[PDB]
Design a protein around this ligand. Structure first.
Ligand code: SF4
Ligand code: SF4
Ligand code: SF4
Ligand code: SF4
Ligand code: FES
Ligand code: ZN
Lengths: 230, 48, 126, 95, 105, 208, 176, 114
């Protein structure tokens, strides 16, 4: 009654029904490497890094949105788990150009951290690397759409919580541009929240753009001003 | 060095100035940075 | 072997050699640091960080640096529980402000209610 | 392209030139304010713009493992030239 | 290829666009097949009607569809770019499509 | 798994494991933890009362000599009611192995002055006294090595910051080199590098 | 595997004992040491004519801390702060702003020549090799303040030569 | 709660140790102030020594008091030696003001120093 038992690497823990595998792993502490999930946004199984192996299953379950049935046992550190993570990391790193110095998320990338702690180190697919030209989003955001990994986090957040309904996917395959097709100046409320929710350096701050870097700055307590919500 | 004395670039001192320190004409440093916070301009017209 | 002992607070604050100016003037702050919200990593949690308050950092008039008269502006101490923080701050004497640890909220999400029939949850594009 | 401040000494390409009241002016008394004579703003204005008829073109900067790495820039726009973030030298198209 | 709009009049509304009231009755049949709650499901047949009425669709066709079908216009842009029928660029009256991949070549 | 990976062996592992279990059996009075490292260097976590019985047992006893005294420092760890760690390293001369005696202590309660058993302990002891503040029971000489004579505060601690509170400079007014409070020109920019995502999941402590 | 010395007896025969007595009382081997010193006295010594000769070096020698720039191009740096990130004395201070032209720039590039421990880490960390460990070692500054290089100082430093630096890089870009 | 102390069974042995140490400091003044070739009167230095003893007066646990006795004992050892020079003996003195009193107003002008 109201308690479902899962065996994360053998260890039993109680999980409420209707919740994902990922909330159970965070309940026992495991951070599954993820790119397109967000803990406050709607879930869509895109990034594929959330794979994990449950035994007696030939396919590999995308644990970003996998519900929890009765009585599970999960191998978080199986061999094909590591193979799948190395593989998805190997796929993502082709069509992302050599821009990590001139990017603005040097200490604050996500590809870099999970590629260190999960991926390989000797790349392949020696030529290729498509180049997609950006749009003119607005004065508030500096936009380099070439680094867009098409993770579809800005679109979901935009159309649901912002409701502006203008970030569109155009095309198929390698040619899938994110944004408004007709170069409308993206001016709406909450249009500045997007520059950090974009997990890669596709979007960035316009005044901050080429000034500094997060390993220099120290971090300090404050409360919101000019608004009584805080 | 008669095999390749120059390079084909337009930035190079033709002088080869010597060790310029210990002279009346040598380096002194300074912070190459503009105005910090643009201190406030008082009003122009006098009142009362 | 169960000797003299009297039970009080501890008096390491006279032993640590820092003057009473920086004892009573500067004040400590004890908190769990923020999740760096651009990334998504709660690995920087589980660490009660002890910090101080920053003070003046004027400009170096020849080089343009952060010329500061603050020896204690560059310390951070890693703790396990809040009790260790309170015992440490009362051990070494200076004042403390402890903030409360604010965990995340386990929130229910479901793909079926994301793509249901007559509700208002409809993403209309994916 | 060095200019001249109204105080008299040379400006810098970074806009930090002095006021009428700065005392680093009076610490520069007697010795050279060593300014650069090479401005990288107008050397790019010296650079011609290449015309490559392809779609997505490369940039290295003259040397295998010399200079900046392989960056592949795009030319799909008609009027906005392809500017390398490492080179800063633009390109055109011949379709 | 070339998924920037690059306005260039013959586009950039107002471009004059219209249907027939007989075609409006066609559109009433189109949103008469679909059940209530999902009025936006007829985007694909209505924009098919738009390609049937004009050999290539301009931007004001999509604007008129965004007026009619109570839809956000960006989804109309998405479906216009997404599939293969909707040649948003001008072609001939007849259009020639040479089918050749695996048995044909 | 075969090339370019550091080779280890089960032989030294089993030998040191059985020897540590044997020592824990034959001294049930102060042993708490016998941890065998994977790279075969033994650590033994110890209560601070029978330190001199442990050292007299480990200098001798004819099954393992260990005539070599080595590193000892009470490595500064906060958050613990017993802060400091006295780790006496012992190296053998006949058997070629390394054991560490990590006994625990706090700041005020003294350890018991190991110079009585080892001749090379004295300057190490005086060093730990001037640097951490670990006091000794029936000790010959507590002086200050490696610090200034007028300096105080036990500067290796996490209590002590990077800079001091003294700054020497000469003046001709009072004609000497005096110590003033600190005047830093540079910030000492503390580059925070603690990145997330848990590279070593096997060393994760269990949460609440 | 041990080879110990001085365990050999002096011979108690009359021969060796009076030979050692002759060594003791007659000053033989000290005169042999004199002969050794004279044998090295009649050499020709390994000195250098210092203002005229300059001794051997390496192509990888780490001196001047000078900058480079592109072939007919812009300033080579990016302000990506890797050199400041790895400098073991925090001797690098880079305050950076972009210019309005789009190409990312700086404001103030700062090297404390007082604080430089002369690694090579800022050379090996720079992706474009903007900051280059220099070839020559002649600073010898009379004043304290002149040991604090600025950006345009390093640019005028790079404006005097690159062909030396390019020769060292061309000989040394393959081993690293 | 069972914690081993340093030396004492109550504060009485601690008071014994610290007053014997202060007697040694008082008798230790004139020889060293003539030897070190100083320029500060005996009254001023003796009052500063007793004022430094009175600075730590708010400590009641005998372990800490015996530890300060050991501190002052090491200090009196290094001053009965001629190891310490004029520098540290003058460093006990505070002649490099730093003039800031506990006025609110003097803290107002030289700001950010509460
Ligand atoms: S977002 Fe892309 S360019 Fe930026 S740091 Fe990450 S991988 Fe590098
Ligand atoms: S712009 Fe950023 S948030 Fe949006 S799909 Fe691309 S990578 Fe994701
Ligand atoms: S590493 Fe090179 S490009 Fe990066 S900031 Fe330093 S000098 Fe500039
Ligand atoms: S060589 Fe000098 S400037 Fe470069 S990293 Fe080392 S200390 Fe810093
Ligand atoms: S989180 Fe990206 S696919 Fe499950
Ligand atoms: Zn380039």
């Amino acid at each position: 009654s109201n308690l479902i038992e899962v065996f994360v690497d053998g260890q039993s823990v109680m999980v409420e029904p209707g919740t994902t595998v990922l909330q159970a792993c965070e309940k026992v502490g495991m951070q599954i490497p993820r790119f397109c999930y967000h803990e406050r946004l709607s879930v869509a199984g895109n990034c594929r890094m959330c794979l994990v192996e449950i035994e007696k299953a030939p396919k590999v379950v995308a644990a970003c949105a996998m519900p929890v049935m009765k009585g599970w046992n999960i191998l978080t550190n199986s061999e094909k788990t590591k193979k799948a993570r190395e593989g998805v990391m190997e796929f993502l790193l082709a069509n992302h150009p050599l821009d990590c110095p001139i990017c603005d998320q040097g200490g604050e990338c996500d590809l870099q951290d999970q590629s260190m702690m999960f991926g390989s180190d000797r790349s392949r697919f020696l030529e290729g690397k498509r180049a997609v030209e950006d749009k003119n989003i607005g004065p508030l955001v500096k936009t380099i759409m070439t680094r867009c990994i098409q993770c579809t986090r800005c679109i979901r957040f935009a159309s649901e919580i912002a409701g502006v309904d203008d970030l569109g996917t155009t095309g198929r395959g390698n040619d899938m541009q994110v944004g408004t097709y007709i170069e409308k100046m993206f001016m709406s409320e909450l249009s500045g929240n997007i520059i950090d929710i974009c997990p890669v350096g596709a979007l960035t701050s316009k005044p901050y753009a080429f000034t500094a870097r997060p390993w220099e700055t120290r971090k300090t307590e404050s409360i919101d001003v000019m608004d009584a919500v805080g | 060095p008669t095999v390749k004395p120059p390079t084909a670039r337009k930035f190079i001192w033709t002088n080869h100035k010597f060790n310029l320190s210990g002279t009346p004409q040598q380096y002194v440093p300074y912070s190459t940075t503009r105005k910090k916070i643009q201190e406030w301009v008082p009003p122009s017209t006098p009142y009362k | 072997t169960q000797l003299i002992t009297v039970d009080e607070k501890l008096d390491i604050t006279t032993l640590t050699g820092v003057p009473e100016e920086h004892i009573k003037t500067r004040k400590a702050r004890i908190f769990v640091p923020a999740r760096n919200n651009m990334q998504s990593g709660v690995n920087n949690t589980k660490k009660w960080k002890m910090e101080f308050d920053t003070r003046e950092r004027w400009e170096n008039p020849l080089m343009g640096w952060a010329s500061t008269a603050d020896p204690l502006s560059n310390l951070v101490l890693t703790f396990s529980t809040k009790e260790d923080a309170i015992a440490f701050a009362e051990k070494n004497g200076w004042s403390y402000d402890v903030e409360e640890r604010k965990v995340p909220k386990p929130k229910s999400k479901s793909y079926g209610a994301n793509f249901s029939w007559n509700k208002r949850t409809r993403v209309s594009t994916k | 392209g060095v200019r001249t401040s109204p105080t008299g000494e040379k400006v810098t390409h970074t806009g930090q030139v002095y006021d009428d009241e700065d005392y680093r002016r009076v610490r520069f008394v007697g010795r050279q304010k060593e300014v650069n004579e090479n401005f990288a703003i107008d050397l790019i204005a010296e650079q011609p713009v290449s015309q490559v008829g392809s779609r997505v073109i490369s940039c290295d900067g003259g040397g295998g493992a010399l200079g900046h790495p392989r960056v592949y820039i795009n030319l799909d726009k008609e009027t906005k030239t392809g500017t390398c973030g490492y080179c800063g030298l633009q390109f055109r198209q011949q379709h | 290829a070339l998924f920037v709009h690059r306005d260039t009049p013959k586009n950039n509304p107002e471009t004059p666009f219209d249907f027939t009231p007989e075609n409006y009755k066609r559109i009433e049949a189109i949103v008469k097949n679909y059940p209530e709650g999902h009025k936006a499901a007829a985007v694909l047949p209505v924009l098919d009607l738009a390609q049937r009425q004009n050999g290539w669709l301009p931007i004001s066709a999509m604007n008129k569809v965004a007026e009619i079908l109570q839809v956000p216009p960006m989804r109309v842009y998405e479906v216009a770019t997404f599939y293969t029928m909707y040649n948003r660029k001008p072609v001939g009256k007849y259009h020639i499509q040479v089918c050749t991949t695996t048995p044909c070549m | 798994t075969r090339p370019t990976v550091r080779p280890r062996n089960d032989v030294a592992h089993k030998q040191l494991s059985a020897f540590g279990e044997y020592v824990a059996e034959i001294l049930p009075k102060y042993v708490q933890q016998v941890q065998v490292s994977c790279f075969s260097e033994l650590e033994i976590c110890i209560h601070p009362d029978g330190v001199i019985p442990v050292l007299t047992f480990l200098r001798d006893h004819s099954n393992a000599q260990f005539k070599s005294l080595a590193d000892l420092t009470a490595v500064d760890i906060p958050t613990r009611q017993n802060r400091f760690e006295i780790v006496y390293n012992l190296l053998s001369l006949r058997f070629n192995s390394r054991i560490r005696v990590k006994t625990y202590t706090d700041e005020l309660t003294p350890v018991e002055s190991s110079v009585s058993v080892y001749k090379a302990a004295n300057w190490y002891e005086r060093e730990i006294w001037d640097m951490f503040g670990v006091f000794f029971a029936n000790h010959p000489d507590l002086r200050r090595i490696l610090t200034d004579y007028g300096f105080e505060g036990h500067p290796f601690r996490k209590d002590f910051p990077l800079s001091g509170y003294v700054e020497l400079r000469y003046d001709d007014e009072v004609k000497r080199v005096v110590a003033e409070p600190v005047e830093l020109a540079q910030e000492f920019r503390k580059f925070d590098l603690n990145s997330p995502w848990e590279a070593f999941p096997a060393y994760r402590q269990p949460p609440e | 595997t041990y080879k110990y010395v001085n365990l050999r007896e002096p011979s108690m025969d009359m021969k060796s004992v009076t030979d050692r007595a002759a060594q003791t009382l007659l000053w033989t081997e000290l005169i042999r040491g004199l002969g050794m010193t004279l044998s090295y006295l009649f050499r020709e010594p390994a000195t250098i004519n210092y203002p005229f000769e300059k001794g051997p070096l390496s192509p990888r020698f780490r001196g001047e801390h000078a900058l480079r720039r592109y072939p007919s191009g812009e300033e080579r740096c990016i302000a990506c702060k890797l050199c400041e990130a790895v400098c073991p004395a925090q001797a690098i201070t880079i305050e950076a702003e972009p210019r309005a032209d789009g190409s990312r720039r700086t404001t103030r590039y700062d090297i404390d020549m007082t604080k430089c421990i002369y690694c090579g880490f800022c050379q090996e960390a720079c992706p474009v090799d903007a900051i280059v460990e220099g070839p020559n070692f002649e600073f010898s500054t009379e004043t304290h303040e002149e040991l604090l290089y600025n950006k345009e100082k390093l640019l005028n430093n790079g404006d005097k030569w690159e062909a030396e630096i390019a020769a060292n890089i061309q000989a040394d870009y393959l081993y690293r | 709660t069972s914690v081993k102390p340093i030396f004492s069974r109550d504060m009485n042995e601690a008071k014994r140790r610290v007053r014997e140490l202060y007697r040694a400091w008082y008798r230790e003044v004139p020889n060293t102030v003539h030897l070190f070739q100083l320029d500060i009167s005996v009254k001023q230095g003796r009052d500063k020594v007793r004022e430094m003893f009175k600075k730590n007066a708010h400590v009641t646990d005998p372990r800490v008091v015996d530890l300060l006795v050991i501190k002052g004992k090491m200090e009196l050892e290094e001053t009965i030696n001629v190891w310490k020079q004029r520098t540290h003996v003058m460093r006990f003195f505070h002649e490099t003001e730093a003039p800031r009193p506990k006025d609110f107003l003097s803290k107002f002008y030289v700001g950010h120093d509460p």
